[PDB]
Design a protein around this ligand. Structure first.
Ligand SMILES: Cc1cn([C@H]2C[C@H](OP(=O)(O)O)[C@@H](COP(=O)(O)O)O2)c(=O)[nH]c1=O
Ligand SMILES: [Co+2]
Length: 136
């Protein structure tokens, strides 16, 4: 099945991208199955709820005692060299926490890297029926 491995926070970049020390190497990790509003790129840019999604991920990983990464069963990095994982901060999955708050939408679902897709879609449906943030 999937397994969690330890990692150490270096820096949170924005809502869905964080830099971590993993097995002794610095890497940027991109959260599987979600897309947060942009803070960066001019062909996207500071989007509504981008500042709040970044701050939520930053708060969540900086205050954690333990960060764990869980790779899915397909490729572990994307075309930019970013690690593709589910990230956990004291056992809470950051990717699901964002979707549950309406600060991310379920996106980039590429098989076989989709083990938690239904769990995330269930949380996104709840954030939409509660009209949270993106969905308000
Ligand atoms: C989440 C994810 C993104 N990506 C790619 C798709 C997009 O490519 P392009 O940049 O060509 O559009 C980009 C989205 O990342 P960001 O949302 O960080 O921009 O990263 C993957 O290749 N695999 C993944 O699992
Ligand atoms: Co994004």
């Amino acid at each position: 099945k999937l397994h969690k491995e330890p990692a150490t926070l270096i820096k949170a970049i924005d809502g869905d991208t964080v830099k971590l020390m993993y097995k002794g190497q610095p890497m940027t990790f991109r959260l599987l199955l979600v897309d947060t509003p942009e803070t960066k790129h001019p062909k996207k840019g500071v989007e509504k709820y981008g500042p709040e999604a970044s701050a939520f991920t930053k708060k969540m990983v900086e205050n954690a005692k333990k960060i764990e990464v869980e790779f899915d069963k397909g490729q572990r990095t994307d075309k930019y060299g970013r690690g593709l994982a589910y990230i956990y901060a004291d056992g809470k999955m950051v990717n699901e926490a964002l979707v549950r708050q309406g600060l991310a939408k379920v996106a980039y679902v590429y098989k076989p890297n989709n083990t938690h897709e239904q769990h995330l879609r269930k949380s996104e449906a709840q954030a939409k029926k509660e009209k949270l943030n993106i969905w308000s």
